[PDB]
Symmetry: D2
Subunit: 124 residues, 4 copies
C-alpha cells in the first residue's frame, strides 16, 4: 500500500528522473536526465509533465507523462503503473513512444519508435 510517484528514480539504461509533488487533480511536473539520446549526450536535462489516475484511489495507480526534449525536435510519451513488488520495493513499469519530427507527411509512417523502461528509486 502506497506506491508514491514523487521522488528520484533511475532506469535500466542509466537515465535519471525526478518527480515533484502530485497535486489534487493528480498532476505533476519534473525532470528528465537522459542517457541514450539516439546519439547519447553528456548531461542534458528536459522537463516532463504528466498525470496519475486517481479513480478509486488505487494504491498502484496508472500514469502518463510527456518529455519535452530540449536538445532535439522529438517528443516522447511514457505510460505505466506504480507497483509494490514482492520484496516491498516501489517499481515503475513503463512503455514509451518516441516521435521523431519528419518534413513531409509522406514519411509519417516511419516516425514512431516504441520500447520499455523500468525505474526504481534512488534516494540514498
Amino acid at each position: 500500500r502506497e506506491c508514491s510517484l514523487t521522488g528520484e528514480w533511475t532506469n535500466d539504461l542509466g537515465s535519471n528522473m525526478t518527480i515533484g509533488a502530485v497535486n489534487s487533480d493528480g498532476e505533476f511536473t519534473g525532470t528528465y536526465i537522459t542517457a541514450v539520446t539516439a546519439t547519447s549526450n553528456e548531461i542534458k536535462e528536459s522537463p516532463l509533465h504528466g498525470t496519475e489516475n486517481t479513480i478509486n484511489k488505487r494504491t498502484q495507480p496508472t500514469f502518463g507523462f510527456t518529455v519535452n526534449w530540449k536538445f532535439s525536435e522529438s517528443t516522447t510519451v511514457f505510460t505505466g503503473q506504480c507497483f509494490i513488488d514482492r520484496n516491498g520495493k516501489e517499481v515503475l513499469k513503463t512503455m514509451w513512444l518516441l516521435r521523431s519530427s519528419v518534413n513531409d507527411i509522406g514519411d509519417d509512417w516511419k516516425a514512431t519508435r516504441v520500447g520499455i523502461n523500468i525505474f526504481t528509486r534512488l534516494l540514498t
Copy 2:
C-alpha cells in the same frame, strides 16, 4: 503559415477534443470527449495535459499529451505531429498507448494496447 494545436478537433473514431492556448513554454491543456461505451450513458469528458516541441520553432511541430480518464482507472498517451498542405488543411497524425490497471505485477505484460488516430478540424 504554421499548424496550430489550439482549437477543436475530431477523429477518425468520432471522438472530439479541445485544446486551450499554448504557453510560451509549449504547455497546453484541453478536454477529450468520447462515447464511453456508447449507449449505457452516452458521452463523457476527461481533462488532458501535454506539450508541443518548440526547438527551432518548426512549422509542423511534434507534441504529446496524457488523457487522464474520468470513468476508468486507465491512462492514455498520444504522441504525433501537426501537419499542413494536402489541400491546405491542418492534420494531427498520432499514435497512442492505452494502459489498463492490473492487480498484480505478474500481469503487467498484458496491460498495454497500442494504436493510431488521425484528427481534423471540427467542421465549424
Copy 3:
C-alpha cells in the same frame, strides 16, 4: 462469411502483395512489393511467410506474417484480422513492427518502429 487471404492486395501507401493458397495447418507464403522503404526504391520484391489462425474455424480469422527483406538487413512482422466490411468488401486491418539491425546490444532500444497498414483487394 468468408474473409479469404489468398490473392492480390494493395495498401494505403502504395505497396502490393500477393498471397498464395493457405494450407491445412493454416500456412501460406507469398510476395511483398514495396513502396516506402525508409528510402523508397524502384520495385524490389521480397518473400513473406505466415499463418492464419483456424481455431473455431472463424470467418474473420486473425493472422500473422514475416517479411524477409531482400535489399536490407531489417525484418518486418505484420499481424491483424481479415474482415467483411459493412459494404461487403474484404479488408485486412494490420499493425506491424519494423526491426532494424543494430551493431551493438547497447543500441537495441532504438531498433523498433511501429505502425499500421490497411489492405483491400486488387484483382480487376
Copy 4:
C-alpha cells in the same frame, strides 16, 4: 562466432521455445510452450514459423516469427535480433504484438497489445 537461432530457449516470463534448423533460405520452424492461463490445465504447445535475415551474412541477424495459438483464436508476432558478447552468451532481444480476434470491424482499435521478451539458452 555467430549467434544461432536453432536450439532451446526460455524467456523472462518462464516460457520456452524450440527452434529447428534454419534452411538456406533463412526459413525455420519450431514450437512455443507456455503455461496456458497457468493451473486450469497446466502447459500447452503451439507451432511457430519464421525467418532470419541473411543479407550480408551478419553475425547477429534480425528475424521474426508468427506463433499460431492452439488454444485461442489469437495470433502473436515477435521480431528482434540475435546478439553475443555480454559474457559470451547468446541473447534474443524481441518485441511482439498480440492480436485478439474481434467480432466487429468497429472494435478493431482495441485488438492489439504490445510488449517485449528476452530469450536465453535453456540451462542445458
